[PDB]
Amino acid sequence: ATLNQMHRLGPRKEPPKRLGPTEGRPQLKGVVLRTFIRKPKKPNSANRKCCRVRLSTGKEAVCFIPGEGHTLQEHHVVLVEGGRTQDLPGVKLKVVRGKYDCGHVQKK
Amino acid sequence: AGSRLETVGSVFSRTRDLMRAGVLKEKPLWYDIYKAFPPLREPVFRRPRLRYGKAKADIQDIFYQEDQIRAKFFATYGSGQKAFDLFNPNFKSTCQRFVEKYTELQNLGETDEEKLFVETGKALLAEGIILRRVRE
Amino acid sequence: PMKGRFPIRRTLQYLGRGDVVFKESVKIMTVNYNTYGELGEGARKFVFFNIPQIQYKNPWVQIMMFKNMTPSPFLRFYLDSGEQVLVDVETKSNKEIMEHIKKILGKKEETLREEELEKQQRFHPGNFGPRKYCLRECMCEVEGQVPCPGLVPLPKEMTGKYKAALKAST
Amino acid sequence: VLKIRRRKMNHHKYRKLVKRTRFLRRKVREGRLKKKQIKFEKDLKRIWLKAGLKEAPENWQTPKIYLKNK
RNA sequence: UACUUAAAAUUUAAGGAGAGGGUAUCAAGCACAUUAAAAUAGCUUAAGACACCUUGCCUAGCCACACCCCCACGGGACUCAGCAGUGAUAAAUAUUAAGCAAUAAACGAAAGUUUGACUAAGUUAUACCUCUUAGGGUUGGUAAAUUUCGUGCCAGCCACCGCGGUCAUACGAUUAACCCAAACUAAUUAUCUUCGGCGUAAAACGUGUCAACUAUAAAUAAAUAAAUAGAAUUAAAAUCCAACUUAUAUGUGAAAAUUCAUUGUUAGGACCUAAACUCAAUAACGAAAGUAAUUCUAGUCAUUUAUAAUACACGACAGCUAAGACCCAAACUGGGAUUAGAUACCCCACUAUGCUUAGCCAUAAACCUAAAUAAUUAAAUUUAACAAAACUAUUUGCCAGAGAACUACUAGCCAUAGCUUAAAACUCAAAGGAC
Ligand code: FES
Ligand SMILES: [K+]
Ligand SMILES: [K+]
Ligand SMILES: [K+]
Ligand SMILES: [K+]
Ligand SMILES: [Mg+2]
Ligand SMILES: [Mg+2]
Ligand SMILES: [Mg+2]
Ligand SMILES: [Mg+2]
Ligand SMILES: [Mg+2]
Ligand SMILES: [Mg+2]
Ligand SMILES: [Mg+2]
Ligand SMILES: [Mg+2]
Ligand SMILES: [Mg+2]
Ligand SMILES: [Mg+2]
Ligand SMILES: [Mg+2]
Ligand SMILES: [Mg+2]
Ligand SMILES: [Mg+2]
Ligand SMILES: [Mg+2]
Ligand SMILES: [Mg+2]
Ligand SMILES: [Mg+2]
Ligand SMILES: [Mg+2]
Ligand SMILES: [Mg+2]
Ligand SMILES: [Mg+2]
Ligand SMILES: [Mg+2]
Numbered sequence: 023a024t025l026n027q028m029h030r031l032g033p034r035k036e037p038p039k040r041l042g043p044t045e046g047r048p049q050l051k052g053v054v055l056r057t058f059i060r061k062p063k064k065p066n067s068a069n070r071k072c073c074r075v076r077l078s079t080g081k082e083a084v085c086f087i088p089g090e091g092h093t094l095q096e097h098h099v100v101l102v103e104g105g106r107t108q109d110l111p112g113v114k115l116k117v118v119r120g121k122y123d124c125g126h127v128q129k130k
Numbered sequence: 131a132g133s134r135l136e137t138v139g140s141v142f143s144r145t146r147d148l149m150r151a152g153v154l155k156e157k158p159l160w161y162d163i164y165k166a167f168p169p170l171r172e173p174v175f176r177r178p179r180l181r182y183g184k185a186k187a188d189i190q191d192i193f194y195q196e197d198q199i200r201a202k203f204f205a206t207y208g209s210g211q212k213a214f215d216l217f218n219p220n221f222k223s224t225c226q227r228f229v230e231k232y233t234e235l236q237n238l239g240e241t242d243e244e245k246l247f248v249e250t251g252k253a254l255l256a257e258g259i260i261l262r263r264v265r266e
Numbered sequence: 267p268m269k270g271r272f273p274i275r276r277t278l279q280y281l282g283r284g285d286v287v288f289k290e291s292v293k294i295m296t297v298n299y300n301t302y303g304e305l306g307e308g309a310r311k312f313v314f315f316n317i318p319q320i321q322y323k324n325p326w327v328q329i330m331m332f333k334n335m336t337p338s339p340f341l342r343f344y345l346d347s348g349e350q351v352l353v354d355v356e357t358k359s360n361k362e363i364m365e366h367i368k369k370i371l372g373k374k375e376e377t378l379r380e381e382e383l384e385k386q387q388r389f390h391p392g393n394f395g396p397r398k399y400c401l402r403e404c405m406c407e408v409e410g411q412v413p414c415p416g417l418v419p420l421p422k423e424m425t426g427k428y429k430a431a432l433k434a435s436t
Numbered sequence: 437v438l439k440i441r442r443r444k445m446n447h448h449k450y451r452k453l454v455k456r457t458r459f460l461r462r463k464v465r466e467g468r469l470k471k472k473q474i475k476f477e478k479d480l481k482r483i484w485l486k487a488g489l490k491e492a493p494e495n496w497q498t499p500k501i502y503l504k505n506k
Numbered sequence: 507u508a509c510u511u512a513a514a515a516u517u518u519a520a521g522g523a524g525a526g527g528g529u530a531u532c533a534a535g536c537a538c539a540u541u542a543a544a545a546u547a548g549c550u551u552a553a554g555a556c557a558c559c560u561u562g563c564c565u566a567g568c569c570a571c572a573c574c575c576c577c578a579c580g581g582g583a584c585u586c587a588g589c590a591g592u593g594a595u596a597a598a599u600a601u602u603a604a605g606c607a608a609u610a611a612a613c614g615a616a617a618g619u620u621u622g623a624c625u626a627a628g629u630u631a632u633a634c635c636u637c638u639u640a641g642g643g644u645u646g647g648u649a650a651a652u653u654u655c656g657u658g659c660c661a662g663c664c665a666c667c668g669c670g671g672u673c674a675u676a677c678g679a680u681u682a683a684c685c686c687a688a689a690c691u692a693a694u695u696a697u698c699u700u701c702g703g704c705g706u707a708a709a710a711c712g713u714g715u716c717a718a719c720u721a722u723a724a725a726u727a728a729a730u731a732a733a734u735a736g737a738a739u740u741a742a743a744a745u746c747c748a749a750c751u752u753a754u755a756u757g758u759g760a761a762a763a764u765u766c767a768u769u770g771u772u773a774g775g776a777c778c779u780a781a782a783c784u785c786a787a788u789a790a791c792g793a794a795a796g797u798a799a800u801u802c803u804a805g806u807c808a809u810u811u812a813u814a815a816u817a818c819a820c821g822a823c824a825g826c827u828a829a830g831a832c833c834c835a836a837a838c839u840g841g842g843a844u845u846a847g848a849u850a851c852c853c854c855a856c857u858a859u860g861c862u863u864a865g866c867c868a869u870a871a872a873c874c875u876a877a878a879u880a881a882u883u884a885a886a887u888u889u890a891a892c893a894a895a896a897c898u899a900u901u902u903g904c905c906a907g908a909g910a911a912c913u914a915c916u917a918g919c920c921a922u923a924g925c926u927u928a929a930a931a932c933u934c935a936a937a938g939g940a941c
Contacts, residue, residue, distance in 0.1 A: 024901070025269050025701075026720060030553080034700050034906080035528085040931095048694040049597040067659040067671090078596070090662060090678070101597070103693045108664065111933080118692085121597095129679085174886085182883045182895070269701045271899070276701090302723040302810085326523055396566055417635065426626035430604090439938085440871095447912065451923080458923045465922065472917095483536065506920045 043083055043114040044104045050115075051122070052077040052085070054098040060084075062109030070110055073117070075102060085115040089127035098123040137175040142168075199229045202247060208264050224259055275318060284319025286364060287373045288327060294344035295320070297331040309339030311360040343371060469502040476501070 023031070044050055052075030059069045071087045073094060086107040087094060094100065094117075101121040107113040120126045131153045133144040142164050148154040181187070203225050210224025222230075232250045240246050251261055267273075274280050288295075297317065299309040313331060321329055341353040341363070351371065355363045393400050406414040422428045454461065477498050484492055492498075 023700080023702090023904090024720095027902075028700065031700085036699080038528090039695095042694090044597090044694065046694065047597065048692095051597070065659085066669095068662075069660080070662090088662090103597090105665090105693065108666090108668090116693090176886065177888095179883080179887085180895075183881090185883050267701075273701085301721085328523080399566065419636080430626065442909090443912065446910095450913070454923050462922070487537085504922090 042104060044102070045079060049101050049103045049118065050077045050079065052083070052100060052102055054094055054096055054100060055082065056096065057094055060086075060110050060113065063111060066109040068109075070107070072110065072113060073100075075100065075115075077102065083115050084113050085117050086110060086113045087117045087124075089119055091128060092117075092124065094124060100124045140173045143172075143174075196229050196233075199232050200225055203228050206247075206263060207261050211260065211262070224254075224261075227257075227259070228254060272315075275315065281319055281322040284316075284323045285372075286320050286323065286368045287378060288320075288324050288371055289373055291345040291347060291349075292324070292327055292343055292371050293346050294328045294330070296342045296344075297329065297339075298336055298342070299331065299339040300334050300336075302334075305356050306339045308357070308359045308363060309355050312355065312363045316360055316364055341367065343367075473500065473502045 055074045055076055057071070057073045060072045062068050062070055071092060072084055073087060074082060075085050076082050083102070085100070085102050099122040101118045101124075102115045103118055104114070105116045107116070117124055131148075133139075133148055135144070138144070139147070142161070145154065145158060145161060149157070212224055214223055215221045228250055231253050232246050235246050235249055235253075240249070254261055268276065270276070297309075297313060299313055300306040301310065317329060317331070321327070338354065338356045341355055343351040343353070345351065353363075353366060353370075355366075358366070389399075391401055394402055394404060396403060402408065404414065405411050406417075412420075480498055481492070
């Protein structure tokens with residue numbers, strides 16, 4: 023662009039930073055609604071443990087439960103955080119082990 | 131160990147540099163000679179480029195003043211029936227004698243080109259040279 | 267590569283090299299120059315090189331330039347008194363034009379120095395406060411004075427916590 | 437290569453979709469123009485009422501500019 | 507506070523050199539102006555008016571607010587956005603504390619009095635500092651650092667690339683090592699921001715003319731073979747009519763259907779529909795689209811140069827509307843064949859349409875996939891590669907990963923299954939270009 027065109031336009035227009043599943047918040051608290059399995063996209067082959075939750079914001083989201091084995095059930099309370107599950111499409115939240123009803127993976 | 135880079139510098143500059151670095155311990159025998167009696171131009175690589183737009187070379191077309199007279203002689207009489215001998219360094223052709231006489235008359239002060247052309251023909255006719263005014 | 271011709275003109279150092287600071291009387295400077303010709307070359311160079319420097323040091327002066335309106339280039343200054351100073355810059359180099367206007371309508375070095383000193387009258391080195399305005403925020407920074415408790419713990423006897431305990435003991 | 441094929445294949449699926457729902461789109465349009473006309477009339481009524489007139493200027497009838505006048 | 511009149515601090519009102527968030531799919535606002543006999547028809551606006559959305563900024567501090575109705579006569583849902591504290595809510599969690607001793611403020615002539623301002627404490631790894639215990643994470647690559655065993659595309663892991671189906675340095679335990687350390691790791695947010703590009707990758711967006719700026723500096727042009735419009739004209743080949751006339755004619759790879767109202771010949775007649783061989787191995791004209799049968803009439807031309815839309819005028823083909831034309835061609839349609847099927851390719855017939863007269867539509871790989879203009883050919887320039895050698899300057903337009911998307915919505919349009927304008931959600935770690 024010419025100096026006259028750069029002057030008439032100024033600095034580049036910047037698209038606003040749209041928020042993610044947590045809505046720009048470190049963590050959210052949600053109540054479990056269902057516990058189900060999600061299948062990772064090929065080539066990955068597994069039965070990943072996830073759950074649907076109703077967040078404090080009022081929306082409903084699908085959250086991956088990390089770790090080897092969870093005791094979560096319907097009506098339980100959990101603290102969800104950000105971080106997408108790469109193989110699981112649409113799963114943009116994860117549960118924090120050791121907070122509220124969810125507990126640390128049971129080393130056995 | 132050497133500098134086989136013939137596109138950077140010259141044989142002399144690369145030899146000077148290699149000795150400064152410490153890789154070449156003995157001077158080549160041709161080195162001192164080049165230092166004392168170098169060439170006029172430094173032999174450095176240059177990529178020949180083409181000329182573009184209105185760039186032109188600077189070569190003078192070699193045209194002497196005799197050529198104006200010689201052109202008329204070839205158009206009027208052609209080349210002399212006697213054959214050119216280009217091995218004799220002092221050869222005088224029929225056309226060169228025409229130009230020598232044409233010059234002599236012009237030194238006298240004749241200003242008309244037509245006068246100098248027909249008078250020279252008459253003088254050579256007296257000399258006995260066979261000039262044929264071949265229009266063909 | 268910076269765009270345009272002579273990109274050095276678009277640097278703060280170049281703009282600050284200008285030495286023509288007009289007197290308070292100067293209010294407008296009209297520049298009449300021709301884009302084609304031979305006797306107006308200095309005028310064209312003055313618009314190209316010097317007008318930015320003049321505006322930088324005289325932000326409140328209106329510089330308005332008109333092109334190819336007259337046979338010859340000239341400068342006309344409009345003063346606050348109502349006087350109009352015409353300058354003829356034909357056959358004059360851009361450097362010559364700057365020196366001429368500096369002489370007739372430019373502040374002298376003495377006047378400018380006095381203004382600079384007066385501007386800084388209220389800054390005192392001894393004054394304490396934020397870094398933006400002062401050298402030192404607190405007297406603890408000074409050598410020999412009691413250091414800040416945050417950096418160096420105070421003696422117990424100089425602390426209100428300790429003094430209160432003794433008063434209770436009394 | 438695949439970018440014109442995709443424009444072609446995308447454009448092919450739009451023309452098919454428009455054909456399947458051509459009659460629905462016609463009724464959508466006639467209603468969007470009617471709302472477009474009412475919005476035009478109301479915007480003109482706002483002007484004279486704000487100016488203080490209690491009736492539209494004498495001999496004025498809002499032109500119907502979105503109807504099948506041509 | 508001084509004088510009985512002058513220095514300040516502090517405000518208020520009216521203003522304006524300049525600077526000042528986002529959306530132009532917010533493009534018009536609709537009285538927003540001047541004059542001062544009260545007339546004139548003006549005022550702001552692509553140099554961004556108007557509308558809407560969002561946000562405290564100008565930081566020794568400033569501005570706005572003080573339960574709500576912008577305000578607070580009035581009304582209402584009737585007061586901690588003072589300190590401490592409580593309920594609810596939230597990922598978010600300080601004492602219902604002491605003293606007016608210091609400084610500040612209020613009051614008093616004053617000794618003095620008052621103050622949840624403030625001061626000294628309490629609470630909390632949130633930070634810094636000084637010390638003393640050591641814990642936290644990681645160990646496939648980026649990126650410092652793994653031994654044994656279990657698991658076997660399962661269980662699990664990853665910021666990106668990826669790992670796991672029997673020798674897993676990548677998962678789990680264990681061993682050691684690495685990093686940091688009263689912290690450590692995770693999540694969230696923040697700090698980095700246009701002088702780069704536009705033949706082939708995002709992007710010169712069909713064509714030209716008129717403005718204002720920004721640049722530039724010269725006083726010419728035209729006289730051109732197929733620009734364009736009108737009128738007149740016609741050579742070859744068809745069509746029609748007529749004479750004579752084979753028995754067939756037509757059609758394919760091969761056949762069938764079609765046909766004998768055909769066929770062939772005509773130095774017979776009519777027609778003037780449609781298209782313009784050779785020239786053309788040419789490279790002209792026009793802004794582009796486009797334009798080459800002949801003749802005649804009208805006709806292209808000077809603005810220094812570049813630079814234009816919200817205006818004006820054009821814009822292949824196909825398509826729409828109305829009245830005509832119709833040799834030939836030909837979507838569609840029917841017939842014949844072909845094939846497992848033919849909804850095609852091949853054959854026959856025939857229509858819209860191609861033509862004219864009036865409008866409309868405004869679309870192309872509208873492409874030389876090259877914006878225009880003036881330079882230079884050397885700057886030790888294959889500055890990727892391939893195209894079309896490279897490159898400087900000027901002005902405008904345009905571009906900012908891919909898909910979603912020649913889409914949705916918006917506005918304009920003779921357009922109504924239309925064109926121009928043109929997003930987001932969401933998804934992926936690529937997409938793409940040249941070799
Ligand atoms: S900053 Fe000076 S005493 Fe703390
Ligand atoms: K896999
Ligand atoms: K209020
Ligand atoms: K006190
Ligand atoms: K381990
Ligand atoms: Mg929209
Ligand atoms: Mg309240
Ligand atoms: Mg109020
Ligand atoms: Mg409180
Ligand atoms: Mg109160
Ligand atoms: Mg906190
Ligand atoms: Mg007092
Ligand atoms: Mg193993
Ligand atoms: Mg790892
Ligand atoms: Mg491991
Ligand atoms: Mg492109
Ligand atoms: Mg187009
Ligand atoms: Mg005709
Ligand atoms: Mg004529
Ligand atoms: Mg027809
Ligand atoms: Mg092309
Ligand atoms: Mg299209
Ligand atoms: Mg569309
Ligand atoms: Mg639309
Ligand atoms: Mg997007």
